[PDB]
Design an enzyme around this catalytic site. Structure first.
Site, short mmCIF file in Angstrom:
data_model
loop_
_atom_site.label_atom_id
_atom_site.label_comp_id
_atom_site.label_asym_id
_atom_site.label_seq_id
_atom_site.Cartn_x
_atom_site.Cartn_y
_atom_site.Cartn_z
N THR C 155 0.84 -1.19 0.00
CA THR C 155 0.00 0.00 0.00
C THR C 155 0.88 1.25 0.00
OG1 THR C 155 -0.17 0.37 2.38
CG2 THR C 155 -1.53 -1.36 1.43
N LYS C 157 1.93 4.42 1.31
CA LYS C 157 1.88 5.24 2.51
C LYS C 157 2.49 6.61 2.23
CE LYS C 157 0.28 2.27 5.67
NZ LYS C 157 -0.84 2.54 6.62
N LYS C 183 -1.10 -1.15 -4.39
CA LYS C 183 -2.53 -0.89 -4.28
C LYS C 183 -2.76 0.51 -3.74
CE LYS C 183 -5.06 -2.07 -1.04
NZ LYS C 183 -4.95 -0.69 -0.49
N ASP C 185 -5.00 3.32 -1.74
CA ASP C 185 -5.72 3.18 -0.49
C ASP C 185 -7.22 3.11 -0.73
OD1 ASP C 185 -4.08 2.97 1.91
OD2 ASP C 185 -3.20 4.86 1.25
N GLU C 186 -7.89 2.29 0.08
CA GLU C 186 -9.29 1.95 -0.16
C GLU C 186 -10.20 3.16 -0.07
OE1 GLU C 186 -7.86 1.26 2.78
OE2 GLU C 186 -6.77 -0.62 2.43
N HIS C 276 -10.65 -5.04 -2.41
CA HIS C 276 -10.35 -4.93 -1.00
C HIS C 276 -11.63 -5.12 -0.19
CE1 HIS C 276 -9.55 -3.02 2.92
NE2 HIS C 276 -8.30 -3.40 2.73
N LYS C 316 -0.11 -10.78 14.62
CA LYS C 316 -0.59 -10.18 15.86
C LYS C 316 -1.38 -11.20 16.67
CE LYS C 316 0.36 -6.57 15.74
NZ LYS C 316 1.68 -5.93 15.93
N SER C 361 -2.31 -8.75 3.93
CA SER C 361 -1.75 -7.43 4.19
C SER C 361 -2.17 -6.97 5.58
CB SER C 361 -2.19 -6.41 3.13
OG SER C 361 -1.60 -5.14 3.37
#
Lengths: 107, 445, 445, 445, 188
Positions: C155, C157, C183, C185-186, C276, C316, C361
């Protein structure tokens, strides 16, 4: 048992029997209580599908008396006793008809 | 830690900002300010370590600001968080962009046990950018020449199985009884047993016949939600050619983009737009997590539309009608003052942008109507699919009974009477001239 | 009581039926059969009393059948319910119609404390009716000439703030490092700081320059999700004219109808479609209520599309990777056997309809890659927005480090080695020729 | 030898396969299994020696399977062969592709003395993929508001030579006698003596006049078969503008592609489609070789259409009405059980896909009508070109006589009477109020 | 000015060549354009009025007297129904036309489609009642020429025989395009 025949009705209280005079007093008092303005419309029943009916004297703004409204209603009824006559409450702040219903139906 | 740059202890939102309210529950024993700042950042900016490209654009100006954490009345772990957004973070009139920027990725962060979007304060500028409803409340009333009373609809039962002729004649029978409209079923657009062209043709013929017979401008809700936008526009234009004054759509399933395009087409072609809230419960059934229905209602009103389904709240669940009336206020009024009980956390003004009709349907029939009139006011529509159809005398008789019940109720309300208590007397007096109303009130006492 | 006509104790589903699994929790002390039959009816048919019109169409044939109630392993109040649906209850290739008929109104019934849609068994006929993905896995591999390894994205940034030139040069820097795609950003389609035309033009120029320099067919994901379908098609055709081989979309926010139309246009124009899952968590974050992400994945695969975001599960939350791998199986394989642990309650076959790439992602970087390769196989894409950009040597160096890490990992996997355990040795050996990889592995040890 | 890989001694067809029946006669003294396997391979795969590229795609999965050889009742050299086909070997809703894959090259192999395609079992999936008839039987009945009786048509005699005015007035005279429709001649679309525009205009005017006079919704079959598809669509849209509710086409001569396009256009525009079987005999006149008319009827029903010519069988040849009634069953019913006598070799189900009207014309007049009603049921149309026109009192009187004969016959059938035997009494009783019927029955006793 | 210094039928070009830069010269205290003598050739090149005086009189069948209009007061605030009924009341009194307000084309309180529909209905009703061919001036001046043409064609479909425009604010180019469209579609 029994059928409900189609009836040429008159737009919100076209189904109920014709309103009594005290009910007309109550309706116009409600119109006054909502800050709206009375307006009288008469038109031949053949042209009920039109968009604008033949208006009576200009809408009464600041008028808060029932008796003058009733006098105007009976005067307009005698003017065209064969036309459909309805009473409409106009709201200036929303540009819509707050309440409207027929008072006199033609012969 | 992200509080230092995404929690603002003393910031006051600008009048052009987008203000969002989130009911947040972080993990146990976490800083509420830190989790609120994490949510705010996850709406705009997120990095796992030191980054370079963010020094080429001023992150200070293009970032959200959570400025107020308030204790929820009922849970001390859940808290209301108010996050600000600079106006530039969105598209000029794209509700889709608003949803993407608001809930696109925030719901995936592990540091939040639950997150719920509660309220949104749209700036006047963004509201003026969006197309809005194509017609509006007063304009729809003018185009239908219907006033004094709320309007009366009904879903065509059964949910499916009808051919074009059968569907058309059922719609005609429902319509000729004084019913204002009829809505097609939300999951019925084009079927192997029924191609949409035949249904539209037959229902247009039936609507024309009923309009000629009853002497009133009538219409049926036609659905254009389909597989492709091309098919949607084709069906909408076909309905336009057939003189049908209103079409219907499912904005969630079809999409916000499709809904906005349909509303723009309706405005460009002078068409009314009906909307159903299919799949809204999947977003608002859970009372603690998801998106509250008021946010979806705001989004639909911005994206355009003339009618929106709500239920009332009553009939099965007395519930918390306060917040329901609150979103009704947000649906109708140009401005709404703050009301914590009604779930209105911002002073929201719509300028002079016309509102949207409310739709009350599902689990209702004649017995509930006085309370429905009392709570929904005059700017609403009532639908009784089974009630009108399940009436033993037929759909026409049931529709006539509901129509005369509504007329009597609005008459008594205009008379200055408290309808809720003496409702039984009102319905008995109405039945004194409508035996179909009497038998209906007998059926579901 | 609705069990008598909507609960089937001994019915066997037909091979052309649509089978749905619901994890249901009714009110306390209610018949489980009765609540399951209520859910099944509320999907198809619902009346509050005796009705007439249902005798004009055979309700017996056009009704759902809940045929099996199974005890959930972990809760005795929650139970799995399997409901059948005759094929005629839906549109020929409309995922929107499927969602409307499945969750349109069932979530509003008061007699259910919680309801969750778990699994759907789509009949072969309905799958053959839908357009499906425009290209497919193998066709995308052919059009990109990339094999052996999974593909590598990132993505761009920060989330926003970039101008056309700046966005294009950042994309070029990311792409020239061996990265497969990037990609957008959505929540970024068209902004006051950045109009979409400039971004598309500059990113096309940068993609062409990087493709010429690196000697590989490359591309960037271009977003067409916008306010209206007309704008979406216009942007898609503009990207087609600029020689860009792939575009991206948000199917939930834009809508199932918009996604289906975009996929049909991509097939008609020979374009790749990236997707997405923005706002999917609002439907699947709650583990007990809502719609499981496998159902949404099935719906997207039916509606068309080449890529779908998943996370992995790891990085995570070690979590329950079993069901994640299950929906991966449902995303890639033509047939999948039943697996209760993987959350696959039906023997689902897709015939010879091509699958969809998986997208992993969010919260991942170099250290996780061996496990990601092990769990996702070779048919997936890995995106590291912050990790590649946050690399101190620049986005190009970070992308090169991730690329060589992926190459070494897939080499060791092809060598017949258990990558998960000796991953540290693998990354050290890779760093023996890539100092940028060494410093990256140092950054997030 | 190809039996080893294309003859399956114990294979059971899958419910998604396409099953085909071939009446095969190989050379004298050849293995029946070998020739059946040769036919099956020649439908899918054929090589003269060892080949390489077939090892890059799994020939095992993409190949047909002949699974049953049965002895024909009447010839021991001719044998019925049942060949299976994987679903993937065809296009999603292309009858043209089915014909190409079934009879494209198999008829050219020297090792077969004769080959005849007998029956096809279309899978439910492929049927759901095809557009199908635009309206259907019940939908056509609704659009014409005609029930109780079969419908009555007539070809406009002579075959050609009429101007627009003359053709229109002849059609009007035929129509005003209670005749349901009139069909243009299959070889008359646009001629130097008659341009199609004038014929369409005059016939539309005549149809409108007759509809006004008789008080019934009437129409004439308009032909759109022409040189180019553009001309076909232009004429169809011109007929649509002139309010004509039905058009006609020749699907074999015009083409399966043209027929499918015309049916799709009719569905998109809400038009009825009539079809004639011109050149069908060249494919089915020979009773031992070619393609049986049931296969062509199946193909037309899949490709779309509302009417299909059959003859009855009777009037000139008592014949084998069993198989004729069989293909009538395949034309009308949603499902048909196997019947060897009726020539139905498979359990074929159409789901809920509407059927097609049957057309009986040629060599018939008033005397045959009772048997025609008995064999064709109520879902059919009867055409008497010469009989109605050759009536000495005029086309209107002949049409009225046939109409009242049909009314009396269907009344007696509804009375519970065996019409075939007492048909003479029925026609005499009808003539007791219709002298034109009496003189007609006198003409062709 | 030699004839070649201008475009064949572009009033915009005439204005650009006449007052484009002359008003900026410091050596002139004041400058005022008084009169222009257009050559017959340039007049024959321009499209000119789409209908003309006598043609408008023929299309309205009104002679003998000048025609009578009125601006719809107040300047704004009316909804589609209210604006339409006010126009109908003005028209049914023998008034020839009514003109919309120059600054009122499309407003948040009133979208132009509703006003056009209601005013067309009112004009039709008044025409039926009074027994005279009547009409109302519909404004097409808007943000874009596409919107202007769309509104003009919508008025054409609704049978309205005349539309109105602001040529200075909209522009000479927009006015010329609107006049050409009116001639091509037979509109006043």
């Amino acid at each position: 048992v029994g059928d409900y025949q189609t009836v040429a009705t008159l737009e919100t209280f076209g189904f109920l029997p014709p309103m009594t005079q005290d009910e007309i007093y109550d309706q116009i008092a409600y119109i006054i209580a909502q800050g709206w303005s009375p307006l009288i419309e008469h038109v031949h029943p053949s042209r009920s599908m039109a968009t604008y009916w033949s208006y009576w004297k200009l809408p009464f703004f600041g008028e808060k008396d029932l008796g003058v409204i009733v006098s105007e209603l009976e005067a307009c009824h005698r003017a065209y006793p064969d036309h459909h006559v309805r009473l409409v409450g106009y709201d200036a702040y929303t540009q819509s008809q707050g309440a409207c219903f027929v008072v006199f139906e033609g012969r | 830690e992200y509080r230092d740059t995404y929690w603002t202890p003393d910031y006051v939102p600008l009048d052009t900002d987008l203000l969002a309210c989130f009911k947040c529950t972080g993990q146990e024993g976490v800083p509420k300010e830190e989790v609120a700042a994490a949510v705010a950042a996850e709406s705009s900016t997120g990095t796992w370590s030191t980054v370079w490209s963010e020094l080429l654009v001023d992150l200070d100006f293009y970032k959200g600001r959570c400025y107020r954490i308030e204790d929820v009345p009922g849970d001390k772990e859940a808290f209301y968080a108010f996050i600000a957004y600079p106006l530039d973070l969105f598209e000029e009139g794209s509700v889709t962009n608003v949803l993407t920027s608001l809930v696109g990725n925030v719901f995936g962060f592990k540091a939040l046990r639950h997150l719920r979007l509660e309220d949104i304060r749209f700036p006047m500028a963004f509201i003026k950018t969006c197309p809005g409803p194509p017609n509006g409340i007063c304009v729809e009333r003018d185009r239908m020449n219907k006033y004094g009373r709320p309007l009366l609809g009904c879903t065509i039962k059964p949910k499916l199985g009808l051919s074009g002729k059968n569907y058309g004649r059922v719609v005609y029978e429902c319509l000729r009884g004084g019913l204002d409209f009829t809505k097609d079923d939300e999951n019925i657009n084009s079927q192997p047993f029924q191609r949409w062209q035949n249904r539209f043709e037959f229902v247009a013929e039936a609507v024309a016949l009923a309009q000629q017979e009853t002497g009133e401008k009538k219409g049926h809700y036609l659905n254009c939600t389909a597989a492709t936008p091309e098919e949607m526009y084709e069906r909408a234009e076909f309905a336009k050619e057939l003189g049908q004054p209103i079409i219907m759509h499912d904005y969630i399933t079809g999409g916000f983009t499709a809904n906005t395009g349909l509303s723009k087409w309706c405005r460009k072609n002078g068409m009314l737009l009906h909307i159903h809230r299919a799949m809204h419960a999947v977003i608002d059934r859970h009372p603690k997590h998801g998106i509250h229905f008021r946010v979806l209602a705001k989004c639909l009103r911005l994206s355009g539309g003339d009618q929106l389904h709500t239920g009332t709240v009553v009939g099965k669940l007395e519930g918390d009608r306060q917040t329901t009336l609150g979103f009704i206020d947000q649906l109708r009024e140009s401005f709404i003052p703050e009301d914590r009980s009604r779930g209105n956390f911002f002073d929201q003004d719509w300028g002079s942008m016309p509102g949207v009709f409310a739709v009350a349907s599902g689990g209702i029939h004649v017995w509930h109507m006085p309370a429905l009139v009392a709570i929904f006011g005059d700017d609403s529509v009532l639908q009784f699919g089974g009630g009108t159809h399940g009436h033993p005398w037929g759909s026409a008789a049931g529709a006539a009974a509901n129509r005369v019940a509504l007329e009597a109720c609005v008459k008594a309300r205009n008379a200055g009477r408290e309808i809720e208590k003496e409702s039984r007397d009102i319905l008995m007096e109405a039945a004194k001239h409508s035996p179909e109303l009497a038998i209906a009130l007998e059926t579901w006492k």
